[PDB]
Amino acid sequence: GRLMDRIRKWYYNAAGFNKYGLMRDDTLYEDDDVKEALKRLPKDLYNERMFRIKRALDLSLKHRILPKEQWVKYEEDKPYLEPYLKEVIRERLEREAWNKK
Amino acid sequence: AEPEHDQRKRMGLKMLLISALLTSLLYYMKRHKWSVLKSRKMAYRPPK
Amino acid sequence: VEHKLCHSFQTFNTSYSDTGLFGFHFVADPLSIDDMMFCAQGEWMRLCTSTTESEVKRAKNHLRSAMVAQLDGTTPVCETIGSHLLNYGRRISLEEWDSRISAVDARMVRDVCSKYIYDKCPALAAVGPIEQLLDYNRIRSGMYWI
Amino acid sequence: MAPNIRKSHPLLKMINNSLIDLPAPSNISAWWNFGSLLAVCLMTQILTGLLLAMHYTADTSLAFSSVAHTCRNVQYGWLIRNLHANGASFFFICIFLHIGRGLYYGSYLYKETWNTGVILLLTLMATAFVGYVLPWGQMSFWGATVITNLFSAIPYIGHTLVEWAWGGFSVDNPTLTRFFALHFLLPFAIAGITIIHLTFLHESGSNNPLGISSDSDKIPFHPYYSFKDILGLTLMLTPFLTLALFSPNLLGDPENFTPANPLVTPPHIKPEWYFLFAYAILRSIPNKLGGVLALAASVLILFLIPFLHKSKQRTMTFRPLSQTLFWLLVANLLILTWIGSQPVEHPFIIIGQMASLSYFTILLILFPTIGTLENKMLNY
Amino acid sequence: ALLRQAYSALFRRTSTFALTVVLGAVLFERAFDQGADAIFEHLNEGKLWKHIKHKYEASEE
Ligand code: HEM
Ligand code: HEM
Ligand SMILES: CC(/C=C/[C@@]1(C)[C@H](C)CCC(=O)[C@@H]1C)=C\Cc1c(O)c(Cl)c(C)c(C=O)c1O
Ligand SMILES: CC(/C=C/[C@@]1(C)[C@H](C)CCC(=O)[C@@H]1C)=C\Cc1c(O)c(Cl)c(C)c(C=O)c1O
Numbered sequence A: 001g002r003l004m005d006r007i008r009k010w011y012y013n014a015a016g017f018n019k020y021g022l023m024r025d026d027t028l029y030e031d032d033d034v035k036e037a038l039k040r041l042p043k044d045l046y047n048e049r050m051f052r053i054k055r056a057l058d059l060s061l062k063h064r065i066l067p068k069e070q071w072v073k074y075e076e077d078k079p080y081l082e083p084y085l086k087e088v089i090r091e092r093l094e095r096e097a098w099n100k101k
Numbered sequence B: 001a002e003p004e005h006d007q008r009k010r011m012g013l014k015m016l017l018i019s020a021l022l023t024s025l026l027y028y029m030k031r032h033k034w035s036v037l038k039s040r041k042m043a044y045r046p047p048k
Numbered sequence C: 001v002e003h004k005l006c007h008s009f010q011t012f013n014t015s016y017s018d019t020g021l022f023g024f025h026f027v028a029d030p031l032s033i034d035d036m037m038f039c040a041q042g043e044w045m046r047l048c049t050s051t052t053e054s055e056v057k058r059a060k061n062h063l064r065s066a067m068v069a070q071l072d073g074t075t076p077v078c079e080t081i082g083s084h085l086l087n088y089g090r091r092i093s094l095e096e097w098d099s100r101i102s103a104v105d106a107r108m109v110r111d112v113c114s115k116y117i118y119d120k121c122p123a124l125a126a127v128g129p130i131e132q133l134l135d136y137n138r139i140r141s142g143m144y145w146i
Numbered sequence D: 001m002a003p004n005i006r007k008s009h010p011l012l013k014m015i016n017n018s019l020i021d022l023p024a025p026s027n028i029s030a031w032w033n034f035g036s037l038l039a040v041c042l043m044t045q046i047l048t049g050l051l052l053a054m055h056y057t058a059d060t061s062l063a064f065s066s067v068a069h070t071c072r073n074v075q076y077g078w079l080i081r082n083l084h085a086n087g088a089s090f091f092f093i094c095i096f097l098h099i100g101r102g103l104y105y106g107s108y109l110y111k112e113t114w115n116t117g118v119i120l121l122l123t124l125m126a127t128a129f130v131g132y133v134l135p136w137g138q139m140s141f142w143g144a145t146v147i148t149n150l151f152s153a154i155p156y157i158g159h160t161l162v163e164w165a166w167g168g169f170s171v172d173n174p175t176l177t178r179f180f181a182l183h184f185l186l187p188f189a190i191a192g193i194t195i196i197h198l199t200f201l202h203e204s205g206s207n208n209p210l211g212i213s214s215d216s217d218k219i220p221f222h223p224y225y226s227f228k229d230i231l232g233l234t235l236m237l238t239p240f241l242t243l244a245l246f247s248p249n250l251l252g253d254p255e256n257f258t259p260a261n262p263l264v265t266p267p268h269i270k271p272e273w274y275f276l277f278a279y280a281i282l283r284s285i286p287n288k289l290g291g292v293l294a295l296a297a298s299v300l301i302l303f304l305i306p307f308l309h310k311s312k313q314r315t316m317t318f319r320p321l322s323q324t325l326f327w328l329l330v331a332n333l334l335i336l337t338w339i340g341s342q343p344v345e346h347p348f349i350i351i352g353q354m355a356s357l358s359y360f361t362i363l364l365i366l367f368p369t370i371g372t373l374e375n376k377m378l379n380y
Numbered sequence E: 001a002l003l004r005q006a007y008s009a010l011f012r013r014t015s016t017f018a019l020t021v022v023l024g025a026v027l028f029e030r031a032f033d034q035g036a037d038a039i040f041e042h043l044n045e046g047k048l049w050k051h052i053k054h055k056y057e058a059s060e061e
């Protein structure tokens, strides 16, 4: 039953961050872990993520969006940060637990 | 209950005209400056 | 020098047949681009408004010598002749150049710099870690008063 | 040394370092213009205020007639009175949008800037309240009576706390003079804290609609936002003046045209429009202390927002469910205001308790819940 | 060409710019005032004391 898929893909188009050309991960709010993760991004993946963002801001100041064609597609969204971030949060839980011992 | 009445409305008139004229002038000036950013074009040319 | 504004800077008056480019170019560290740019436009405005006779006197003598060092060899003199006919039409003698250079004074400099610089919309090119330098709108406002 | 006298001077380095060379996100929308408008109001209120204070007379036997004289006799007094009273309203309108913006765009993640904000709100409220009491009209009085009476709900130190408040054993002259003192003072404390509000801000910088770092794209406050704010000013100013000049009393209760009567509480006693929503909640809980607590919490609940944030994203721009909930909440307050302006009779009473219950749930339970939910739908 | 004539003479020099704003504001006032008052009084013919006035003003006794 492709329900969860059906839903996720729906919510994805609902959000609309793809209309700006941002990957689901370019929208994460930068708390402490996210900040660390980003420092671990390989030069190129970081420079691309930057442009995507600097481009979305420029869109927002102009009050426009990308022509439908260039919109990110639910299945082509690269979760470029997701795995780094999970490790950062895993390294952190270890420390946290180890200091209570 | 309010002797000003008449003068209060004569003012309201002057206020609309100046307000009209002024909001316009400043709307232009605001757009004028901002144009620099409105028309702006950027491209990502990573080295290869 | 006082403030360590740059690594180098240079004025330039590139000319062409019908047009031209009159400006300046400086190199600096990311964190001082702003002040340099600031002082720089500042000195341009000082040209259009308060140039003195002392400044022009030296200016002339410095130009005269550079004008002569232009012809320091056969290659250079040949280059002058080649480019003079091709651009100015005929050949312009040093005795002539020098007469024109002496004709200049304060009032002239001010009236001319004001002619091509004051309140004009300039062209900008920035390359490198240029974050500290910013907004055309600002740079533009540096073209008057200052 | 410092070349320009804009970056070195111990003072101009401030006008310049906090409003001219200030780094601002290039994409802040009109919802960010309320900061300045709020600021401008403060200066306008304070100014028109002094002008009035120079003709008012804090004394029961003279308050009402002083204001009346201030209008009918003082040159342009009538205009100044208007501007001051209607500024109070546009001040609140602005502050409410200023808050909404913060809520909708997760600016509350800027905790200190936010908490000082809430403090500001409470202060502005207390101020506008006591101002409204000075003309010593019917609302003036009964308002003074009910609000100071609120402390009476605090056990023990309660019934005493009321004694100071009044300076006697029932509202009277002392209350009116210590109220004028209080009103005269607070605005400055507002201006003071506003400085801090803006200072904490500056540590981080402004937020922006998409809620993602705008370091890759900042711009100098001037002339971008200085011009944008001048314009945003001439816009708010138009209806503020259209209102104050063409329909003066549109926004205000008329009971205050009747000199206070210690023996008669008007049957249609409502507070100024900007307090209704709370007045509405107070009239929900049919118990002295409960209503009081609900009232307190109706504003103090703002302190909890920062802690009830579950979304992995900062704003609601890309959260369609939070949006609906957010707008459902706005309409929710919009209702309480209507309720606050109606009598304590069916169907109102029931609709009332609902909207209140609704208000506190959308904030303490829903939002944080839908938020978590949304995170899962993104696969986080 | 006024735009050029104006720019060159008024708007260029930040000092003449000010003189224009002052000199202008003065003219603008005197005229905008009459006009508005004129529009207002017209919109209220026979209702203002300016109109009624002649009936008692040195007309009786
Ligand atoms: C005296 C009352 C107030 C004044 C004069 C004031 C002033 C300012 C100013 C000028 C700004 C900067 C511009 C802007 O972003 O709007 C600002 C930002 C902000 N204020 Fe206020 N404020 C007031 C009340 C409040 C209140 C009541 C809150 C909280 C409920 C609040 C929350 C904020 C926050 C969160 C910011 C950051 C906005 C952002 O994310 O960009 N302020 N305020
Ligand atoms: C925080 C900014 C201010 C707010 C919110 C405010 C609000 C009010 C309100 C709501 C009233 C009642 C208006 C009416 O309906 O008649 C009022 C009146 C008054 N305020 Fe303020 N006020 C402010 C600042 C000031 C200050 C600092 C002064 C003087 C220095 C001042 C002096 C007065 C006086 C004398 C009155 C009473 C007479 C009248 O109503 O005209 N106000 N104020
Ligand atoms: C109070 C104010 C501006 C006030 C005036 C008074 C200027 C000093 C000169 C011209 C004007 O008339 C503005 C309204 C701005 C407040 C203000 C801020 O403090 C900050 Cl940190 C930011 C990021 C913004 C962004 O929009 C802002 O508007
Ligand atoms: C809205 C409110 C109280 C608001 C305060 C007390 C906040 C709870 C805290 C900060 C303040 O200073 C406000 C004035 C009380 C309700 C309320 C009023 O406002 C007013 Cl004017 C009146 C005449 C009544 C009469 O019954 C009332 O019940």
Ligand SMILES: CCCCCCCCO[C@@H]1O[C@H](CO)[C@@H](O)[C@H](O)[C@H]1O
Pocket (backbone or CB within 6 Å): B007, B010, B011, B014, B015, B018, B019, D237, E037
């Ligand atoms: C931003 C809007 C500003 C509006 C300015 C209008 C100035 C009010 O103008 C007033 O008009 C009255 C009757 O004509 C005169 O009696 C007053 O002396 C005059 O100041």
